[PDB]
Design a protein around this ligand. Structure first.
Ligand SMILES: O=[N+]([O-])c1ccc2nn[nH]c2c1
Length: 300
């Protein structure tokens, strides 16, 4: 059974997964994605340090591979992260001049989005803009451009490809009690009212065991920011308890604006934290209990 087809049967858009050439050409990743997932994301090959490792010298080979694979297999595509402090090459990090960085940032966004114009359902435009306490993270972008970097990034993105849904993404939004959760809500409300085209909030959902239950209330909170969409991104759960996974799926089912869920990867060995067995397929590419439990939940 296909979690993507069951999500669609329940009125959602997709169940997605992150991938890259190195996965698609190995194991059972491609076969599982074909059968079970309706949306793919280049895991790493659109991140700034991969795709623009020296300024204005882009390397699209890896991203092209995923985009072409997706098209050939009838999958939706997400891309990102366009602006993300933690995946920057050093040439970006060292810039101290506002106009310089603004133009670099605009060029980076426009170049990526125009290359695939019309093909991409979602771009994750800005990631990790908030500190844990809800303040804006003092990244090179905030420090050199100011808070306007958000507006500039999103307006640039909307100009580059108005067909795409534009998302802000952040982590540790998995509890309604966390200050970061409300902070992103109220800033997104403020920004959208000021004309910033933020179509979605994507919750990068990297959970420890037992944290799924929190998402049942965090996601409705996120949805209160009034974006047209919300989503679950980069989903993984240490231990991969069915209880945690079903909770995350149910949170999305319970939120009308939640269009879908993207898993961080297919099989545990390829996780960023493989030893925590946090994904839905084991290293033999067999579905784990949590995969079966999500299927069964969506069927009922
Ligand atoms: O949801 N995802 O797994 C995922 C992976 C990489 C990305 N980069 N930008 N957005 C992403 C989403």
């Amino acid at each position: 059974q296909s979690v993507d087809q069951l999500m669609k049967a329940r009125g959602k858009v997709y169940f997605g997964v992150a991938t890259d050439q190195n996965r698609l050409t190995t194991g059972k990743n491609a076969a599982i994605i074909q059968a079970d997932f309706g949306m793919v994301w280049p895991e790493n090959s659109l991140q700034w340090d991969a795709v623009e490792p020296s300024q204005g010298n882009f390397n699209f080979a890896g991203a092209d591979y995923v985009v072409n694979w997706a098209q050939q297999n009838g999958k939706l595509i997400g891309g990102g992260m366009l602006v993300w402090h933690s995946h920057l090459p050093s040439w970006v990090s060292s810039i101290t001049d506002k106009e310089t960085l603004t133009n670099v940032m605009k060029n980076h966004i426009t170049t990526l989005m125009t290359r695939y114009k019309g093909k991409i359902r979602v771009w994750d435009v800005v990631g990790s803009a908030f500190n844990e306490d809800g303040s804006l993270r003092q990244t090179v972008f905030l420090n050199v451009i100011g808070e306007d970097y958000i507006k500039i990034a999103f307006q640039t993105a909307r100009a580059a490809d108005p067909n795409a849904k534009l998302y802000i993404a952040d982590s540790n939004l998995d509890s309604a009690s966390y200050p970061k959760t409300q902070a992103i809500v109220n800033k997104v409300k403020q920004w959208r009212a000021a004309g910033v085209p933020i179509d979605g909030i994507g919750s990068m959902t990297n959970l420890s065991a037992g944290q799924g239950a929190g998402v049942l209330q965090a996601l409705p909170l996120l949805a209160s920011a009034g974006t047209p969409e919300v989503s679950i991104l980069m989903l993984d759960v240490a231990g991969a308890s069915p209880t945690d996974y079903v909770n995350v799926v149910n949170a999305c089912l319970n939120v009308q604006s939640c269009v879908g869920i993207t898993s961080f990867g297919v099989a545990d060995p390829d996780s960023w934290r493989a030893s925590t067995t946090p994904l839905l397929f084991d290293g033999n590419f067999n579905p784990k209990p949590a995969y079966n439990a999500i299927v069964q939940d969506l069927q009922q």
